[PDB]
């Protein structure tokens, strides 16, 4: 049974775009722009795109297309590095454990939006505290006693019923049902592979853009939207002197493009050999970043409208993360005429943003492990059910009363330093141990031209240096786990560190296992470990390029 190919090129392109574009593009990037010099922030962000993210996008796409393997089994080219693929698969599973809970929040809000009186508009509900204040009468983004903030935290999260990560409580049945719907949708999107996932991304990857267009058209007309847009784009070039601006740009690029997460390789593994993955990488990464920039306009139109409504400044309402889309934006919707339609479309947009990223993350695991074990390849529906059901069970923790604390711990540690280290290790493998020249020969075989000197230099020095820089800052910028005013106990930090290390130790562990399992002398074992599995007959002939300086000096 040969590997199938995408039904269309558009299927592959929309899968890549839907994975790359998600809630991050919307609820993180515009805030980073606003707080890091506005238009000035685009300089570090675009720079890092061009020199690290587009190169990594291109490398992962070409690797997947050429080898037609998942993240794990692609390391037939460099056997010692298969622990890196195992680590990225584990990280993708970890991420899915909490990403689907955010998707379930979006689904909960969408269900709540099917009314003419949105539950977050007013007080007087069962979840409202006695201190709830009508927002018309009312820093602000964290007031916590508005109907929207109270609705979120007390009728969606029920966070008031949990003291901390030590008292997370039981899963909440409403969020449990929303999670069940999310996982059922994911299963029936993924159980038949790309033949159906590529058609599902036609909806999931494109609907967000229609919603964004209508949201932009309406928001630009809102009172005070121009002030919010000016705050969004106001250029402060002196912010570029600060290291934090560049750190934020690098982290945003790395995490928003999703290169090296095992998803793009899995998607490209279903490409036809002659597909132009260079142009695909350029187009898809550009689409991701431009989507972020465009969505910032709608976000800050609504933020300026809210600031004008409350007679406050933009900094008093500017927020990021769940706070923005689940407290600030719903209140603005409730203020707008036709608030029901706006809420419905906004939360359908959130669902569409999240669902295809979850699809990509789960396909990373499915493809990577099915390529590794042929039994899983033979049983796609059963293995997909196993993956989705395990994700549901281990996301049950994040829908508990204190599930927000578990989700904070996971969001911090599942795919932070661990994913950065894994991507650094795989970039190093590909561009140094396997060889950037070998990779260029592979791309020439696929596409008829070798990648230019710029891309090779990026792969060998700039992308590795960028990844090492982000790893180093992530380690340096470790702030003990906290959520709002809550400070996690030390054991919670230990658990998060264990989660981060669980995937990171797979790399040295797999290298040790490969060395010990291989037969021969020390140098024979090393040569087998660093030699492509289809060239292992050459080792007996003592013909190893990695043992020559020319291989390492290849630029």
């Amino acid at each position, epitope marked *: 049974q*040969p590997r199938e*190919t*995408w*039904g269309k090129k558009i299927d592959f392109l929309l899968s890549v775009v839907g994975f790359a574009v998600d809630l991050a593009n919307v609820w993180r990037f515009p805030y980073l722009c606003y707080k890091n010099g506005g238009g000035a922030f685009l300089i570090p962000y675009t720079l890092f795109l061009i020199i690290a993210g587009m190169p990594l996008f291109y490398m992962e796409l070409a690797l997947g297309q050429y080898n037609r393997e998942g993240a794990a089994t692609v390391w037939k080219i460099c056997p010692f590095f298969k622990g890196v693929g195992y680590a990225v698969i584990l990280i993708a599973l970890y991420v899915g454990f909490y990403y689907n809970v955010i998707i379930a929040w979006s689904l909960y809000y969408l269900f709540s939006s099917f009314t003419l009186n949105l539950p977050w508009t007013d007080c007087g509900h069962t979840w409202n505290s006695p201190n709830c204040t009508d927002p018309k009468l009312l820093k602000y983004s964290k007031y916590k006693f508005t109907p929207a903030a109270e609705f979120y935290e007390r009728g969606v999260l029920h966070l008031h019923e949990s003291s901390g990560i030590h008292d997370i409580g039981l899963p909440q049945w409403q969020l449990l049902l929303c999670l069940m719907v999310v996982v059922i949708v994911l299963y029936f999107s993924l159980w038949k592979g790309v033949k159906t996932s590529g058609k599902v991304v036609w909806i999931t990857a494109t609907l967000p853009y229609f919603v964004l267009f209508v949201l932009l058209v309406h928001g630009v007309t809102l009172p005070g939207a121009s002030n919010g847009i000016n705050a969004y784009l106001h250029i402060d070039f002196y912010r570029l002197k600060e290291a934090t601006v560049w750190i934020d740009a690098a982290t945003q690029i790395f995490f928003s493009l999703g290169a090296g997460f095992g998803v793009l390789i899995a998607f490209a593994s279903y490409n036809k*050999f*002659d597909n132009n993955c260079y142009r695909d990488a350029l187009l898809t990464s550009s689409i991701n970043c431009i989507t972020s920039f465009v969505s910032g306009f709608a976000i800050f139109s609504i933020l300026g409208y809210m600031a004008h409504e409350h007679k406050v400044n933009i900094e008093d309402v500017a927020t990021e993360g769940a706070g923005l889309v689940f407290i600030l934006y719903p209140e603005a919707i409730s203020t707008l005429s036709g608030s029901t339609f706006w809420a419905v479309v906004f939360f359908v947009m959130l669902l569409a943003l999240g669902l295809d990223s979850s699809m990509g993350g789960m396909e990373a695991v499915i493809t990577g492990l099915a390529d590794d074990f042929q039994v899983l390849k033979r049983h796609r529906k059963l293995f997909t059910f196993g993956v989705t059901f395990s994700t549901f069970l281990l996301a049950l923790f994040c829908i508990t009363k204190g599930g927000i604390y578990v989700l904070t711990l996971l969001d911090t540690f599942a795919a932070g330093t661990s994913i950065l280290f894994a991507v650094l290790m795989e970039a190093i493998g590909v561009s140094w141990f396997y060889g950037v020249d070998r990779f260029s020969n592979d791309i*020439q*075989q696929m596409m008829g031209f070798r990648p230019g000197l710029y891309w090779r230099l990026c792969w060998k020095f700039v992308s590795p240096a960028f990844l090492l820089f982000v790893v180093v800052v992530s380690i340096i910028n470790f702030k003990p786990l906290t959520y709002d005013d809550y400070i996690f106990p030390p054991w919670a930090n230990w658990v998060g560190w264990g989660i981060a290390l669980s995937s990171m130790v797979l790399v040295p562990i797999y290298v040790i296992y490969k060395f010990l399992s291989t037969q021969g002398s020390l140098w024979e074992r090393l040569a087998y470990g660093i030699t492509p599995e*289809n060239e292992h007959h050459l080792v007996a002939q003592r013909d190893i390029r990695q043992f020559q300086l020319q291989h390492w000096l290849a630029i």
Partner: nanobody, 119 residues
Framework: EVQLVESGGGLVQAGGSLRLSCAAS????????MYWYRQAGKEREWVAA???????IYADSVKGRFTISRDNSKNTVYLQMNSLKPEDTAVYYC??????????????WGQGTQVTVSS
């Protein structure tokens, strides 16, 4: 069943020409990624490819000398090799990578045809 039948190989005099054929069955070559490889105590090295859209690409060592073509009616891919060198001596393998989009990645290889160039 997908089958690639290599033919046309044989002994050539340095500077001579040879037309290798690859009769393909089970798929249409006019939409497939058809690749030619060769394996001289050396690894299998890509030689030329005629791709699903008809684009012909060649390895550097053979570029300008070899010409890859395909006959849609005969479902055959031709590697027309001119100006053959003693370094071209090898077993030439016709390979189908896939039949384009909405197809399968049958990375199927023919048994290969030996080409010998005598100085």
């Amino acid at each position: 069943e997908v089958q690639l039948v290599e033919s046309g190989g044989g002994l050539v005099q340095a500077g001579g020409s040879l037309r290798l054929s690859c009769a393909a069955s089970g798929f249409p070559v006019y939409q497939a990624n058809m690749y030619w490889y060769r394996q001289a105590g050396k690894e299998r090295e890509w030689v030329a490819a005629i791709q699903s859209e008809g684009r012909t690409i060649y390895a550097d060592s053979v570029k300008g000398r070899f010409t890859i073509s395909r006959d849609n009616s005969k479902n055959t891919v031709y590697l027309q090799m001119n100006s053959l060198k003693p370094e071209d001596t090898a077993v030439y393998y016709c390979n189908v990578k896939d039949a384009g989009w909405a197809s399968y990645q049958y990375d199927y290889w023919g048994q290969g045809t030996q080409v010998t160039v005598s100085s």
